[PDB]
Amino acid sequence: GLEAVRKRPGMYIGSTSERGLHHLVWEIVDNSIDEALAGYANQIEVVIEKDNWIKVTDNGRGIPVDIQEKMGRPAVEVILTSSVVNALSQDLEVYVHRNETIYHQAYKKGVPQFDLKEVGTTDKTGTVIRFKADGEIFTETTVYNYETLQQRIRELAFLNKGIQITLRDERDEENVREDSYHYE
Ligand SMILES: CCNC(=O)Nc1nc2cc(-c3cncc(F)c3)cc(-c3ncccn3)c2[nH]1
């Protein structure tokens, strides 16, 4: 299932080049866009963090955490273990703010490192996905381009007016850059 994504990456994302690397971001952002189109999220945040980790945050309902009829595993674990981004990431973390609780799970090459755990309390709702693209899959470059992400984030904000979409570059902690889009 998920081992097939690691052997044929291009079959799922197109290429293991700069284009494919950026497609990973788009596959996570699209989920937050779906949550905004469903009527629950109105704020999306994309962060290029240190060592080219990507953090995508929305203020939707939070990916469901309820135990399933099929697996006996939380809905979020089922969803993430079928995720191409998760399969192609050397590391991926999830934080779900839901039911006044903060739930967390980490994966390595799509494989869960521990069971979903409650790690805090919250008055907010939403999902946080942090991932570090697998450097063995992505050989050409693992370095994100700001202008490529910005150009697309601005188009998404224009296609989904009323949704606040923010892009931040934190790779240089001494010089942080931010572009926030919010069309009326
Ligand atoms: C950072 C990436 N953001 C998300 O993945 N946001 C997100 N919010 C969700 C809410 C529901 C959701 C919550 N409550 C009730 C529902 F019916 C759906 C379901 C999903 C989901 N479902 C299938 C695949 C991927 N994501 C969400 N993703």
What is the SS3 string spanning 129-163? EEEEECCCCCCCCCCCCHHHHHHHHHHHHHHCCCC
Does the CB atom of residue 56 touch ligand 1 within 6 A?
A: yes
Does the CB atom of residue 93 touch ligand 1 within 6 A?
A: no
- Pick from 89, 84, 82, 124: which is nearest to 103 by CA? 124
Alpha carbons within 13 angstroms on the beta-carbon side of residue 7 total 4
Q: How many CB atoms lie within 10 A of CB 62?
A: 26
Ordered structural domains, the chain, with CATH:
1-184 (3.30.565.10)
The Å distance, Cα 32 to ligand 1 centre, comes to: 7
**Residues 61 and 125 sit within 8 Å (Cβ to Cβ):** yes
**Residues 134 and 89 sit within 8 Å (Cβ to Cβ):** yes
Which helix (H) or strand (E) segment holds residue 95: the answer is strand 89-98
Sign of the alpha-carbon dihedral angle for 96, 164, 146, 8: positive
Return the biggest CA–CA distance within the chain: 49
Strands (DSSP E) along 28-78, which ranges? 43-49, 53-58
**Residues 25 and 5 sit within 8 Å (Cβ to Cβ):** no
The Å distance, Cα 61 to ligand 1 centre, comes to: 7
Which atom of ligand 1 is the closest one to the Cα of 41? Answer: 8
Does the CB atom of residue 61 touch ligand 1 within 6 A?
A: yes
Write out the two tokens for 52.
């080219």
Does the CB atom of residue 26 touch ligand 1 within 6 A?
A: no
What's the rounded Cα separation, in Å, for the pair 113 and 105?
7
- The residue whose CA is least distant from atom 9 of ligand 1 is 63
Q: After what residues is the chain interrupted, C–N > 2.5 A?
A: none
**Residues 76 and 103 sit within 8 Å (Cβ to Cβ):** yes
Residue with tokens 């273990």: 81
Which phi and psi angles does 40 have, rounded to 5°?
-115, -30
Write out the two tokens for 65.
């955490």
Does the CB atom of residue 126 touch ligand 1 within 6 A?
A: no
**Residues 45 and 128 sit within 8 Å (Cβ to Cβ):** no
Which atom of ligand 1 is the closest one to the Cα of 57? Answer: 1
Does the CB atom of residue 110 touch ligand 1 within 6 A?
A: no
What determination technique applies here? Answer: X-ray
Does the CB atom of residue 79 touch ligand 1 within 6 A?
A: yes
**Residues 113 and 106 sit within 8 Å (Cβ to Cβ):** yes
